[PDB]
Design a protein around this ligand. Structure first.
Ligand SMILES: Cc1cc2c3c(c1C)C(C)(C)CC=[N+]3c1c([nH]c(=O)[nH]c1=O)N2C[C@H](O)[C@H](O)[C@H](O)COP(=O)(O)O
Ligand SMILES: Cc1cc2c3c(c1C)C(C)(C)CC=[N+]3c1c([nH]c(=O)[nH]c1=O)N2C[C@H](O)[C@H](O)[C@H](O)COP(=O)(O)O
Ligand SMILES: [Mn+2]
Ligand SMILES: [Mn+2]
Ligand code: NA
Ligand code: NA
Lengths: 465, 469
C-alpha cells in the first residue's frame, strides 16, 4: 500500500524529486522557485529547511503530466484515457477500509494548544491577504446521505485556530453545509481536512466524479485496493490513514470572514468576498510530518497541469457521445477551461456547429468555455502552428464564426458585461463542403506515412539535437 | 569577404550547423527531416550523403530568425528596423552602390555545356508526395529588361521537365516576368537571356528577397547589409552578372512562345495549387565549384523557411507603422498564419475604443496588410510573439460578442479560396485590451505582479539551489 512517502521515494529514484537544503522562506520565495521549476518542466521539490519552521514543505508534486500519470500507478499520460472509460461506466463500488490506528494520529494537539502558526503555510503572491492552505482535502458529509465528498478548497489563515473555507457554491462541501443548515438549524457543521494523503486519494479528490459517489471509492479503483482510512477523533468523518497532517473542527453557523484578495489561476487577484469560518479544534500528524502545498497564478501552474492530464480522462467520454471527435484539448494558456480546440472527422455540411453545441452543453466542466475552435483531423489540436494555419486558411471570419449571447459565465470572469452572464464564440475552421461555399476548395498537403515512419526509425541515429 | 562556406563554418562553430552522414533521399525524406528540425527550432542541415548523388544538400539555412540576423552580420533581428527607416526616406547618393566585377571566380571552376548538360546529376528535391516533379527552390534568377541596366534578382520556383529544361514560374508582377514581357515586345522572336545562381553568400540571398523598388538592383541592397560591394562575375554565355561565390550557376534562355504546364505543387499556404502554364527556361551551361554544395529548401504548411524569412523581413515595417501610430509597441505576423493573414499588435492604450482605431490602421495604412483578415490587439504587457501571452489576453480580457469586430465585403486575396467570392471577404478584429470605464461597468482585474526583491534573491541563489544537476 503506497502512501505518499513511498511515492516520494519512487520519484527520487527517477530524478523527479529534488531536496533543497538552503534556507527558503514560505513567504513568497518558495512560489518563485517552484514557478521557475515548473515552467522549465523540472522535478517535484522538497524544501527541507523552510526559514522559521521544522516541517519540510513539498510542492510542485504534480508539475509535469508524467508525474500525474505516475501518481495513478500508470507509466505514462496516454493511460489516462483508460481511466476515462472507467469513469464513463459509473454513470458495487468499493467502500473504505477503516483501520483501528494510523500514522496521521501519532502526534495530537487540541483546544487551546492548536496553533496553525507552527505549520509552514505559504504566502504565494505579494498582495495576497495572508498565508493560504492550498492542498487540503476537505472531507464532509451532508445530512441526507452517507457519501463522504472530498474537495480542494483554499483556506486563508485568520487566527491560531481559524481558517476561511473558500468553497464555491456548486462544490460538494458547500452543498453539504447548506443542507445541514436547513436540516439542523444552529448546529455546528463537522469538517476535517487531510494534508498529504497518498496520490491516488489526492487525484481522486480532484477528478470530477458524480456527487452521488465518494471520491474515496474512485481512488480505490485507480489504486486497485481499498482506500485505507481512520475515524477522526472529534467526529464521524474518515480521513486517509497515511495523511501527513489532519485538521479537525467545525463551521459555526452564520460565522463568516472577508476572504482575500488572493491571486488566482487566471493570473489576476480575486477581490475580497465573505466565506464560512472553519474553527480548528484538533491537529493530528505523523512523526516527521511533511507539509504539502502549492500555488495558483498565471498559467501554467500545478493546477493547470493537473487540468491537462484530467482532460485526457474526458476525451473518451466525449468520444462515446460524439464519435466524430478525434481530439479535444483545453490549452493551459486559456486559464485551463476558457478555450477548447476540437478536431473531427467531418461527415456533412454544418457538422462543426453540432460539435460546438455539444462542447457547450454535454458536460458541465465545459459549460463555461467561451471560445471553441473546430478543425478537421489533419490538424494537431495541440500545436498552435496547425490551429492558426486552419483558422487562417479555412475560415471567412464573418461566415464561419458563431456568437451566442446571454450564456452562463463564471461569476469571477470580470471580462463579461455582467457577473454570471456573457457571450461565447465558436470558430468553424473545418474545410467547407458544397453548400457551405461555392468555390473550389484547396487540396491540402498530406505527408507520405512511409516517409514519416522511416524518419522516426533513423531519428535518434541522425542525432540532430 | 564572407562567401557561403565561411558562413557555414561560423554556424558550425556555434552549434547551428549539423552534418548528416546517413544516406538520405532528396525525394521526400530531406523535407521531412528539415520540417521536424525547423518546427523544433533546430540548426541548419548539411546532408553529406544524399542517396544517388555526390553533391551535398544544404537546407534549413534560415530556419531560425537568429540565423537570418547572423546572415546579415548582426547579433539580433532588429538591425532590420534601421533598414525600415532607410527605405522610408526614398519616397542617400552612395546607396547607388554598384557591383564589383571579378575576372574569374570559383563558381566557374567546372563548366559543362550543350549536350553535356544534365540537371539530373543535381540533387534537386521533391518536397511533397503529390508534387509534379523535382523543384529548384533557392535559385536567384537574374534578368535584365531591354530598357534599363538594372539587374533584378528574384526567387522563382523552377520545375524540372528535362535534362536541360526548367519551368520559370514567375508571377506577372515580378521583375523577371516584366523584363521578359518587355523583351518580347521590343525584340520579337529573340531568345531572352537568363541566369540562375545557387548558393550565393547570405547577404546576396537575403537581399534578393527584400522588397526593394523595381528601379534598384537587389545587388545594391545586399551591399548595404554587408557593408562592402557585392562581388560578381560575368556569365559565360551572356552579359548578366552572378555572385562570384555561387556554388552552382545555370545559364541559358527562354525561347519566346515556349511554355509548359507547371505543377501541381504544394505551396506556402499548405495546399497544392492546380496546374498552370509558364515559360520554359532552356539551360545551355552549368558552371560550378570544385566540391559544389546544392542549396535548397521547401515551402509547405507554415511555418517553413520562407515564412521565417518573411517574419524577419517584416521587422522592416514596424518603424514605419510606429511613425504613424506611436502607441504601437510591437507588430507581428506569425509564420503559421501564412505570413500575412493574421497580425498581433501590442499598444500603450490611451483612451476607450483605442483598439478599434489601431485595427483600422492595420487594415488601411500600408498595402502589405490590406489583405490581413485577423487582427488581435493587446496591451504592452503581452509579448506578441508568444501564444501563451496572446491566448492569456484573449481569454481574460475579452467578451467575445462585445469585443469582436467583423467587417464584410473587404478586399481579399483572389487565391484565398476560403472567402465566399473571389477577391472579396470579411475580416475580424479581436480587441483584447483591458477594458476601461465606458467599455465595461465591472471592476477590472489587477494582474499579479512579482516582488522584484524576491526575484533578485532567487536569481542569486539559483545555481546553488541546483535543481537541474
Ligand atoms: C487542485 C486544486 C483545486 C482547487 C483549488 C486549488 C487546487 C490546488 C487551490 C487551493 C490551489 C486554489 C483553488 N482551489 C479551489 C478549488 N475549488 C474551489 O471551489 N475553491 C478553491 O479555492 N479547486 C477545485 C476543486 O478542488 C475541484 O474542482 C474539485 O474536483 C471539487 O470537488 P467537488 O466537486 O466534490 O466539490
Ligand atoms: C524565399 C522564397 C521566395 C519565394 C519563393 C520561394 C522562396 C524560397 C520558393 C522557391 C521556395 C517557393 C515560392 N517562391 C516563389 C516566390 N515568388 C514567385 O513569384 N514564385 C515563387 O515560386 N517567392 C517570393 C519572391 O521571390 C520574393 O517576393 C522576391 O522578393 C521577388 O522579387 P521581385 O519583387 O524583385 O520580383
Ligand atoms: Mn465530489
Ligand atoms: Mn528586384
Ligand atoms: Na471533489
Ligand atoms: Na526582390
Amino acid at each position: 500500500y503506497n502512501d505518499l512517502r513511498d511515492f516520494l521515494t519512487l520519484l527520487e529514484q527517477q530524478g523527479e524529486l529534488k531536496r533543497i537544503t538552503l534556507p527558503v522562506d514560505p513567504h513568497l520565495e518558495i512560489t518563485e522557485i517552484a514557478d521557475r521549476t515548473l515552467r522549465a518542466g523540472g522535478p517535484a521539490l522538497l524544501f527541507e529547511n523552510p526559514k522559521g519552521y521544522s516541517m519540510p514543505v513539498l510542492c510542485n508534486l504534480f508539475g509535469t503530466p508524467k508525474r500525474v500519470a505516475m501518481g495513478m500507478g500508470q507509466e505514462d499520460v496516454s493511460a489516462l484515457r483508460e481511466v476515462g472509460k472507467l469513469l464513463a461506466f459509473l454513470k458495487l463500488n468499493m467502500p473504505t477500509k477503516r483501520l483501528r490506528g494510523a500514522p496521521c494520529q501519532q502526534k495530537i494537539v487540541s483546544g487551546d494548544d492548536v496553533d496553525l502558526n507552527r505549520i509552514p503555510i505559504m504566502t504565494c503572491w505579494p498582495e495576497d491577504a495572508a498565508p493560504l492552505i492550498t492542498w487540503g482535502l476537505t472531507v464532509t458529509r451532508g445530512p441526507h446521505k452517507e457519501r463522504q465528498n472530498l474537495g480542494i478548497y483554499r483556506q486563508q489563515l485568520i487566527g491560531k485556530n481559524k481558517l476561511i473555507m473558500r468553497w464555491l457554491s456548486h462544490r460538494g462541501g458547500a452543498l453539504d453545509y447548506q443542507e445541514w443548515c436547513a436540516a439542523h438549524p444552529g448546529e455546528r457543521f463537522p469538517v476535517s481536512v487531510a494534508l498529504g494523503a497518498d496520490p491516488a486519494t489526492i487525484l481522486g479528490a480532484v477528478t470530477p466524479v458524480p456527487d452521488t459517489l465518494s471520491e474515496y471509492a474512485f481512488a480505490g479503483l485507480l489504486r486497485g485496493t481499498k482506500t485505507e482510512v481512520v475515524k477522526c477523533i472529534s467526529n464521524d468523518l474518515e480521513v486517509p490513514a497515511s495523511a501527513e497532517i489532519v485538521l479537525e473542527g467545525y463551521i459555526e453557523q452564520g460565522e463568516t470572514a472577508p476572504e482575500g484578495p488572493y491571486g488566482d489561476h487566471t493570473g489576476y487577484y480575486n477581490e475580497v468576498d465573505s466565506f464560512p469560518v472553519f474553527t480548528v479544534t484538533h491537529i493530528t500528524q505523523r512523526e516527521d510530518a511533511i507539509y504539502h502545498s502549492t500555488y495558483t497564478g498565471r498559467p501554467p501552474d500545478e493546477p493547470a497541469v493537473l487540468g491537462v492530464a484530467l482532460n485526457e480522462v474526458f476525451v473518451p467520454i466525449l468520444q462515446k457521445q460524439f464519435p466524430e471527435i478525434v481530439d479535444f484539448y483545453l490549452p493551459p494558456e486559456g486559464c485551463s477551461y476558457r478555450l477548447a480546440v476540437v478536431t473531427i472527422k467531418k461527415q456533412y455540411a454544418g457538422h462543426a456547429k453540432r460539435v460546438m453545441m455539444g462542447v457547450w452543453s454535454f458536460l458541465r466542466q465545459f459549460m463555461y468555455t467561451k471560445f471553441v475552435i473546430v478543425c478537421d483531423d489533419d490538424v494537431n489540436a495541440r500545436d498552435w502552428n496547425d490551429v492558426i494555419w486552419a483558422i487562417t486558411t479555412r475560415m471567412d471570419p464573418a461566415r464561419d464564426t458563431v456568437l451566442v449571447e446571454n450564456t452562463p459565465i463564471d461569476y469571477l470572469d470580470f471580462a463579461s458585461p455582467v457577473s454570471g452572464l456573457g457571450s461565447k464564440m465558436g470558430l468553424d475552421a473545418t474545410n467547407k463542403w458544397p453548400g457551405e461555399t461555392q468555390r473550389e476548395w484547396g487540396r491540402p498537403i498530406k505527408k507520405d506515412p512511409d516517409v514519416v515512419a522511416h524518419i522516426d526509425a533513423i531519428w535518434d541515429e541522425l542525432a540532430i539535437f
